[PDB]
Amino acid sequence: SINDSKILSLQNKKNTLMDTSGYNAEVRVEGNVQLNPIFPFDFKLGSSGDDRGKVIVTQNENIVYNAMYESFSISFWIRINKWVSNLPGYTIIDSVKNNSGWSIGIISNFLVFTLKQNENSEQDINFSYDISKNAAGYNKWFFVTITTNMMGNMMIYINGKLIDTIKVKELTGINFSKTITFQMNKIPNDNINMWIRDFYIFAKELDDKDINILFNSLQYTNVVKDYWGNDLRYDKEYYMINVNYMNRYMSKKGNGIVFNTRKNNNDFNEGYKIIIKRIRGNTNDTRVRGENVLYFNTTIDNKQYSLGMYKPSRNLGTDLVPLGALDQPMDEIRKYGSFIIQPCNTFDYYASQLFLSSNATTNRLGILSIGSYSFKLGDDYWFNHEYLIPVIKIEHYASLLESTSTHWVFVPAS
């Protein structure tokens, strides 16, 4: 197993941060450090005040290096908020003693891993997130994996995917520090938070196969995630957005839901919010899971509507039915407004696919896509108007299964 090479395993256990690898490294906690009492059992750090938060992990004895050759791998889940593209320099995870060791930091849209041999010798490698795809900041959970071979390459992975590979030329060896300090420290040239969970160190070079297994094993893939990677929940306000139309928010005109262009990318707080409601499922713990039957409520002008099918003023195309906001009872929601959810995560986003349910069962009649169509809504009368609407393709939709126009994300309102 790959756990045979695991020399450190920082985990929250019984509301206490500790090493669970077996090597029993000392873990001291100081300042404002908040531990999550539920999964993923993360710990939260800040960057403001003298009491900001500090986790000192002192590796107990030399034992830990007893099975090491010239390779080691670091892996951890991490979330940063608000990770703006013009963020100033911050060292976040430091393990450098006497100008030797390694250090992880963040600056602008870069997460940089620096490997130090001495004063004069260091090599770094980074992941830079796509600014155009994250205009509101890269504020989502992501899985870092960093592998290093002194006689080979220095590699970095994000969400199981290889981002960059640099050959180790300048560095001959590394005398590692026995201390690792998790603390957000501003580099000498608005406040940000950082969540971390399952910080592992391995005494070997993990390959792509092992990194993807590790990536998936640390997740509950059946549990659908919100836009930031947290567990999607019932009975909670979200902004429902389509992957292909991130600069659109949800609005209403007559029976129909319509998508309008948002004002800016400061945040997603614009338009009407949805609330997800459970109908069927194997578990009942508030979390939304794959194959759950559900429906959507939305409050508009102090009245709640449910998302459901309606007849458009004229036909939009073969096997297409538009999704509108309707004030109707549960029997009608079960017939014409119930959906079977299915998680759909990619490197770029945590999303989902929604299939039209037959009588609130797991039987599928169609898939929820998006598109612009010319017809009449609300007080329209004289002319037809192009409306970007959510639309269900029924019966025949195998080609839409692979389309990103069926990928829906949920941004929490909070």
């Binding site: 007849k311 458009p312 039915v321 014409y336 039987n363």
Partner: peptide, 15 residues
């Protein structure tokens, strides 16, 4: 299931 599709077409599509 085939009756479900014809029912939806009957209700939500124009004639």
């Amino acid at each position: 299931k085939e009756d479900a599709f014809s029912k939806l077409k009957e209700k939500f599509m124009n004639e």
